[PDB]
């Protein structure tokens, strides 16, 4: 969801943890919060 410079060596990569906690809201906005939110909230897929 957040592009990264391919040129960057692996260990130089940035964490995948979004910058803001994930809410309990299910709106257009929160549905695109991060990958996890998009997958679970927008599409409705879950591992539990």
């Amino acid at each position: 969801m957040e592009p990264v410079d391919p040129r960057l060596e692996p260990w130089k990569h940035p964490g995948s943890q979004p910058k803001t906690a994930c809410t309990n809201c299910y709106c257009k906005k929160c549905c695109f919060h991060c990958q996890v939110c998009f997958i679970t909230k927008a599409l409705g897929i879950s591992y539990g």
């Binding site: 969801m1 592009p3 990569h13 996890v36 897929i45």
Partner: protein, 256 residues
């Protein structure tokens, strides 16, 4: 075939190990998506690179080409795969920390068994083991190439907008989650499909090159338009099969 080892046609996928033990084609697709889901979730919690996640997602997709979902549950393999991917992508997390994060995601209410309990020390073993099994099943082929790489590179070469380039990378990640493209097409091609897809959502048209070649001809040689529309179609088919929620909360409100 060593370069073709982990690539399968539609028919070949038509028959997987899982299928062998009576698992419906769709049933398997979900186990896959779900595994991606848990992998991404555990990944963000351990805060590893999205590179690590992508890698584990593939280790997982290839893994279930040999082993069955029946004998190895996604919720068991996922934590092992990620734990491995983390070492491969040079952002290693301690075994404990992964175990904890997994427990948290799979057992929200319960509490982390004492780091001395047999219940705990047991899974430390199970994980280490599933690890070596994962290694042996992938035939130690650890280096993975993802579409993301080619997506970024291309969006830059076509002066793609900021968010268009972002949407593009966003699809590349969805292709690893929602589809099996990583078992059917090479990254470069996937990347083209991801971009083609975004431009379709954003009405962005990439003009032909000042040398006459189409944009994708700068990503991979084998790609054609026909291919793009066909694969974009399948990706939509997959998207339309998820119990897609948005369609209902799609407009009403925002928040704070």
């Amino acid at each position: 075939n060593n370069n073709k080892r982990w690539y399968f046609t539609r028919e070949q996928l038509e028959n997987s190990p899982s299928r062998r033990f009576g698992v419906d084609p769709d049933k398997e697709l979900s186990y896959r998506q779900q595994a991606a889901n848990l992998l991404q979730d555990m990944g963000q919690r351990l805060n590893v690179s999205q590179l690590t996640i992508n890698t584990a997602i593939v280790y997982m997709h290839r893994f279930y080409m040999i082993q069955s979902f029946t004998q190895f549950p996604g919720n068991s393999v996922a934590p092992a795969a990620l734990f491995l991917a983390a070492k491969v992508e040079e952002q290693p997390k301690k075994l404990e920390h992964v175990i904890k994060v997994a427990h948290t995601c799979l057992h929200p209410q319960e509490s982390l068994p004492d780091t001395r309990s047999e219940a705990y020390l047991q899974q430390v073993q199970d994980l280490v083991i599933l690890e070596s099994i994962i290694l042996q099943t992938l035939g130690f082929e650890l280096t993975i190439d993802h579409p993301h790489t080619h997506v970024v590179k291309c969006t830059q070469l076509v002066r793609a907008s900021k968010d268009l380039a972002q949407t593009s990378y966003f699809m590349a990640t969805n292709s690893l989650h929602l589809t099996t493209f990583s078992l059917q097409y090479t990254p470069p091609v996937v990347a083209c499909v991801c971009i083609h897809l975004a431009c379709k959502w954003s009405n962005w048209e990439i003009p032909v090159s000042t040398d006459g070649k189409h944009w994708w001809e700068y990503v991979d040689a084998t790609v054609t338009l026909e291919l793009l529309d066909e694969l974009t179609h399948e990706f939509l088919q997959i998207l339309e099969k998820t119990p897609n929620r948005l369609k209902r909360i799609w407009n009403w409100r925002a928040c704070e």
